[PDB]
Each structure stands twice: as structure tokens, then as C-alpha cells.
Design a protein around this ligand. Structure first.
Ligand SMILES: C=C[C@H]1CN(Cc2ccccn2)C(=O)[C@@H]2CCC[C@H]1N2[S@@](=O)(=NC)c1cc(Cl)cc(Cl)c1
Length: 127
């Protein structure tokens, strides 16, 4: 399925080239510009654990998730990953725990040492 495919066929977008965050672009977005540090970014997303369970979805809330890019307001992989996206892009990310919740996990949905899958759509970004 999609998690296996990004695991096996994704591109390493980490600066360290340690394969901690792999990406596939599923829907090409608009133009060439990606957001800049500190921008307000608006995303829709859905996340799955490695046991196949959905652990979250903004779609199901009928409102986007909004954060300021590059400020550690989200897991490291999201700051790295969303920074690579164009407006209107849909991407898959496959994230090792060192770029997510590590050994601590995040109670009560995300276990210790969890590799995560996301589908993310970058709706908009604004300074
Ligand atoms: C619930 C919305 C955020 C949560 N955060 C930031 C964050 C803020 C406070 C505590 C833990 N994590 C995040 O960094 C990431 C990435 C952005 C989308 C969501 N998460 S998340 O989907 N990451 C596995 C998530 C993270 C948790 Cl603890 C619960 C749920 Cl239901 C979903």
C-alpha cells in the first residue's frame, strides 16, 4: 500500500541524508515557490501508524491545521517536509521516530519508537 511504497520508493529530503524522512509527490502543486520560515501554513493531512491504524485526520475535523513553519511547533519531519512543498501539492511522508516522537511517543495514540506515514496537502502559505 501507500506506506510501503513511500518506504521503498521515496526520496530522502533530510539535510543529513540519513533517510529519516522520505517523500513522494502525489499531486504536483503550483509554480516553483515553497513557503519561507515563519510563514503561516495551512494543511490538510491524515496520519497512519505502522500497524495500519489511522491516528489523526484534519479532514475529519472540517478545518485545516495551521502552524508557523520552521519554528518547532510540529514534529521535525513536518517542518522539513512542508518546507519542500508547493501550494496545492499533495505529498506522502514516511518518518522515522528521530524526526517525530522518538522513544517518548505521544500518549495516547502514538507508541514509543513509532515510524509514521502522512498524506499532506499544502493548501496555502502566507507571511
Ligand atoms: C494534533 C496536531 C499536530 C500535533 N503536532 C504538534 C504537537 C503539539 C503538542 C503536542 C504534540 N505534538 C505535530 O507535530 C504533528 C504534526 C502536525 C499535525 C499534528 N501532529 S500528529 O498528526 N503527529 C503524529 C499528532 C500528534 C499527536 Cl500527539 C496526536 C495526534 Cl491525534 C496527531
Amino acid at each position: 500500500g501507500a506506506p510501503a511504497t513511500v518506504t521503498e520508493q521515496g526520496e530522502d529530503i533530510t539535510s543529513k541524508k540519513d533517510r529519516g524522512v522520505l517523500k513522494i509527490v502525489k499531486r504536483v502543486g503550483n509554480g516553483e515557490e515553497t513557503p519561507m520560515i515563519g510563514d503561516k501554513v495551512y494543511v490538510h493531512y491524515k496520519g497512519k501508524l505502522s500497524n495500519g491504524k489511522k491516528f489523526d485526520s484534519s479532514h475529519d475535523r472540517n478545518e485545516p491545521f495551521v502552524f508557523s513553519l520552521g519554528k518547532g511547533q510540529v514534529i521535525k519531519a513536518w517542518d522539513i517536509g512542508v518546507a519542500t512543498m508547493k501550494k496545492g501539492e499533495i505529498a506522502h511522508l514516511l518518518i522515522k521516530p528521530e524526526y517525530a516522537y522518538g522513544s517518548a511517543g505521544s500518549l495516547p495514540k502514538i507508541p514509543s519508537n513509532a515510524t509514521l506515514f502522512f498524506e499532506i496537502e499544502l493548501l496555502d502559505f502566507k507571511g
